[PDB]
Structures are given as structure tokens and as C-alpha cells.
Design an enzyme around this catalytic site. Structure first.
Site: not given
Ligand SMILES: Nc1ncnc2c1ncn2[C@@H]1O[C@H](COP(=O)(O)OP(=O)(O)NP(=O)(O)O)[C@@H](O)[C@H]1O
Ligand SMILES: Nc1ncnc2c1ncn2[C@@H]1O[C@H](COP(=O)(O)OP(=O)(O)NP(=O)(O)O)[C@@H](O)[C@H]1O
Ligand SMILES: CC(=O)N[C@@H](CCC(=O)O)C(=O)O
Ligand SMILES: CC(=O)N[C@@H](CCC(=O)O)C(=O)O
Ligand SMILES: [Mg+2]
Ligand SMILES: [Mg+2]
Lengths: 258, 258
Positions: B8, B11, B45, B162, B217
Site C-alpha cells: 500500500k 503520503g 491525500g 489503509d 492505520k
């Protein structure tokens, strides 16, 4: 299986919930009454233009193609490969259609290269590999393909949706129907032209009757028609009652003969 | 084949070309030296926040999740399912990786429903069908899955990446590695915590050490760990030299034990 049928969607279609409902109703009806597997290719200047508008970004289209600067490819990709594609996937789900979203680079379905430095990140679409899509079709999925592509060097390319559809038609040996806001190609008086040949297209272009986007659309249709050896239709998605007959073969717009 | 490995990504990774290059270099090296098929799930994001920022749109995250109004789901979908997903597909192509972009709704890989009316178009992800992705993996493709999903009623949903990754891990019976900007979960002094249990997570949460996004998360990782019966790692993508060992199993961040 049979040669698939590619239905290309674009225009203001995405701005109408009613139009989308009637369209998918017709798609379900078609799928449940035909063995020819469907494939959807879509554009979306609609979702893009409204967005570019709100962003105070100019929309310069050189010879029917949107000049796509490097600083705009990401947002255009978001609007086309993201918003437009997923909106259609949502409608498919709403109608219990098992669809799979893809862009031109998936399985190298359609090969793309930079068309012209003056256009920026605008891709030239040519036939690719039908393996991925053929496998999806054989497994019962409805591929919904956006017109964003990628070069071998990893650069995202904005491809005119009509040209992308034609390139995919060649790749899959698929029949093709280009759906737009208008009932095919119109003459100088705004009336529908029933049949189209290369010679006639040249005439109309020379006379300034076929301009902008339509020049790109017709040339794409003619290319497909000559490559496939089968007629290609340009028709409208606006009228509910015409959809069933259209998807079955009844000429409702302009039929390109090659 | 073997249980796949889901990596995954999220960030600020997407803001660094250098980081992306080093990451894909490590992905190629891994793929060419391991039989365990890879699957990428990504958030973003990063691409979303920068966009929401430029649009003067506020970013309200309730309990780690982004409140996603109906008037913003389309643009978020564009940024996540479109821009972020295709950017990763472009990098894969640049490195000669045959990748296929997907979102949670494709092949109903991950089932999504509205999580909470107070959050708007935010989806609750749960295990779906592994058939589509398993077929792609068996055919040699690298699935790159975005965290946008869709409800059975055709509503697009924004799912925390997540949680989407954990739901997909359960669906595929895949091992899972969550890569972030930081080296795992940090304690009150900002130092890396090597191992994590539910009891410890509860403690840290009670003490206010694990907050926001990290609460989401960790809970996602713990859920995956208990569902799979295998440890789950949370680590950084920032350091090139650590990537190979990380992808091979060396604990570089926080290992969730269930
Ligand atoms: N002679 C002509 N006949 C018909 N349409 C014409 C003609 N000349 C120009 N046009 C234009 O062609 C447009 C058709 O092309 P285009 O605007 O790109 O729509 P689209 O391809 O259906 N949508 P999309 O995929 O989202 O771009 C029409 O709506 C007309 O504005
Ligand atoms: N105790 C904590 N330990 C570590 N990180 C923490 C802690 N408390 C809060 N955080 C935050 O958790 C963030 C990690 O979650 P998140 O910000 O959503 O990144 P991501 O999931 O990697 N990215 P993406 O998929 O794009 O959202 C860090 O960068 C910290 O700001
Ligand atoms: C290059 C180019 O013109 N692209 C098209 C793609 C979408 C479509 O055909 O609707 C565009 O408007 O941005
Ligand atoms: C609901 C929700 O928080 N969504 C995430 C999805 C992307 C991610 O995890 O990076 C979001 O920021 O919009
Ligand atoms: Mg067009
Ligand atoms: Mg996160």
C-alpha cells in the site's frame, strides 16, 4: 466469441442523469438480448470543460484537439480517467452490470505516442494488444475504457476519444458506434446526413461544413470503416426511443461507408 | 499461485519523482527475484490535499477520515481514481511493468457501503470477490488499485486507503505492507515502535500518542493481522537502501502482531 461492439460515449451525456438512466436501460436490454459482447469507450470534454472553466483555465483546441500542457495533464487525467470513467462504472453497478474500468495503457490495449509538440501531452492512438480486453470479455465483464493513454516512457497522454475508440476497434476487430449530442453529421442547413464516404467528407471539409471536433470524428470513423471493412455509425444518445433500434443496427444518424 | 503481497502506497510519495523512481526500481528488482505476485493499493491525500488546497476547499477529517460531501466526491474521485492511479500506471510502464489500473468496484473486489451519514460519501470497505484480481495475477499483470469504491446503488465512495488495503488483503488472502512517510508508528518521543499488539495500540490511543490517521492505520493493520493470522508491517518508502530488505521481510518499521 463474436466481434465485440464498441459504443463510444461523449458530449454532454454525463451532465444528464435522465439520459444516463435511459442509456443504461438500453444497454442492459441489449446485453440481455444479444451475444455480441459490449465495450464502452468514453471521452468527457463535458466533465473536463466544466472543470477547466471553473479553474479559469482556457480551452484551446488546435484542429479539433485540446492543447494539453504538461501542467494540465494531471487534472485532465483526473477528470477523464477518474471522474468520467468511475461515474460510468457507478451507473453500470446501479444496473447490475459487471464492469471493469480501464484506460488505454492497460494491457497495452491501445498504443500511444506524442502526436505533436505543439499540442503538448496529446497522444496519437494506434492499435495495441486485444489480449487483456478479450479475456475480460470472455469472463463476462463490460470494459469501460477512458481516452487517457501513456507512452512507453511513462508520460500520460490525452487522446481524442473518437480516435481512441477507432484504435480500439481495430485492436479488437470490433464493430463501432460513435454516440454524440447530435444526430450524426449535419449539412450546411443543420440537417442530418444519412451516409458518408471519404469523397463526400473531403467535399464537406472543403466547403467548411464539417469543422472542429467533427473533422476529427469523421476522419476517425472513416479510418475505422476502411480498417474493419464494415460501416461505422455516428448517432445521438439523446432520444430514448431510438436507442434499442440503434444498438441493433437501424441507421439513426450518419453511416460511414468505406 | 502463492499468496500475493499487497504493497500500500500513500503520503507525500507522489510528490517525489526521485522517491517514485527508487521505489519502482525496488519493485522491479523484487518482481524479478520473487514468485509471490504483487498487488499495489494506493491512497493519495497528497494529490487530493494539494488540489483541495488550490480550490480553497477545507479539509475536515472526522476521526481520521475525510468528510466527503456529495459536491466533492467527483473531484476527489478524479484525483484518486484518476490522477494518482494513472500516475502510478505511468511509472509502471516506464519500468516495463505490465500493470492494470482498478478501483474497488472492479470485479467487486472490495464491497463498499456508506459508513456514516455524517461523513458523506465515505465508504466502509469489507472483503469482496478475488476472482478478477486472481485472474489478472495469474495472467502476469500487476494490479494497481485505488481506494475509490462504489455502493450497489451506484454511489461513489471515498475509502481510507489503509482500510481498503486491509479489505483487499482479506479478499485475496494476501500478505500486507503499509508504506507511509514515517518509519512505522512513533511513540511520544517520536521514536519508532518495533512491534505492535492490540493491547499496546489501545494503551497508546488512551495516552493520546496514536492520533488521527494513525489510529485508522493501526486499527486497519491489526484487523488484517488477526484476519490473515500473519504479521502486518507499517514502514517508510523514504529510504532507498531499506526497500529491498523491507519487501523481503526484514522488519524496518512497526510489525503488527495479531
Ligand atoms: N458539419 C458538422 N456536423 C455535425 N457536427 C459538427 C459539424 N461541424 C462541427 N460539429 C460539431 O461537432 C461536435 C461534435 O464533436 P465533439 O464536440 O467533440 O463531441 P463528442 O466527440 O461527441 N464528445 P466527447 O467524447 O466527450 O468529446 C458537435 O456537437 C458540433 O458542435
Ligand atoms: N503515534 C503516531 N505515530 C506515527 N504517526 C502518527 C501518530 N499519530 C499520528 N500520526 C500521523 O499518522 C500519519 C500517518 O497516516 P496518514 O497521514 O493518513 O498517511 P498515509 O496513510 O501514509 N497516506 P495516504 O494513503 O495517501 O493517506 C503520519 O504522517 C503522522 O502525521
Ligand atoms: C486531445 C483531446 O482532444 N482530447 C479530448 C479527450 C476527451 C474527449 O474526446 O472527450 C479532450 O477533450 O480533452
Ligand atoms: C475517507 C478517506 O479518508 N479517504 C482518503 C482516501 C485517500 C487516502 O487514504 O489517502 C482520503 O484522503 O480522501
Ligand atoms: Mg469529440
Ligand atoms: Mg492515510
Amino acid at each position: 466469441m463474436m466481434n465485440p461492439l464498441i459504443i463510444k460515449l461523449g458530449g454532454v451525456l454525463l451532465d444528464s442523469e435522465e439520459a444516463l438512466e435511459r442509456l443504461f436501460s438500453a444497454l442492459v436490454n441489449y446485453r440481455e438480448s444479444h451475444q455480441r459482447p459490449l465495450v464502452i469507450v468514453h471521452g468527457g470534454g463535458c466533465v473536463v470543460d466544466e472543470l477547466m472553466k471553473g479553474l479559469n483555465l482556457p480551452v484551446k483546441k488546435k484542429n479539433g484537439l485540446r492543447v494539453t500542457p504538461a501542467d494540465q495533464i494531471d487534472i485532465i487525467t483526473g477528470a477523464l480517467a477518474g471522474t468520467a470513467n468511475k461515474t460510468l462504472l457507478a451507473w453500470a453497478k446501479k444496473h447490475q452490470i459487471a464492469a471493469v474500468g480501464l484506460f488505454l495503457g492497460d494491457g497495452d490495449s491501445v498504443k500511444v505516442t506524442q502526436l505533436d509538440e505543439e499540442l503538448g501531452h496529446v497522444g496519437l492512438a494506434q492499435p495495441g494488444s486485444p489480449k487483456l480486453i478479450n479475456s475480460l470479455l470472455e469472463n463476462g465483464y463490460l470494459p469501460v475504457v477512458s481516452s487517457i493513454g501513456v507512452t512507453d516512457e511513462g508520460q500520460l497522454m490525452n487522446v481524442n476519444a473518437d480516435q481512441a475508440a477507432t484504435a480500439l476497434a481495430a485492436t479488437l476487430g470490433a464493430d463501432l458506434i460513435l454516440l454524440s449530442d447530435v444526430s450524426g453529421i449535419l449539412d450546411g442547413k443543420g440537417q442530418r446526413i444519412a451516409e458518408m464516404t471519404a469523397a463526400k467528407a473531403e467535399q464537406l471539409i472543403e466547403q467548411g461544413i464539417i469543422t472542429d471536433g467533427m473533422i476529427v470524428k469523421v476522419n476517425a470513423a472513416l479510418d475505422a470503416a476502411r480498417t474493419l471493412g464494415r460501416p461505422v455509425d455516428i448517432a445521438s444518445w439523446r432520444h430514448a426511443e431510438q436507442l434499442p433500434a440503434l444498438f441493433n443496427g437501424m441507421p439513426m444518424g450518419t453511416r460511414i461507408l468505406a
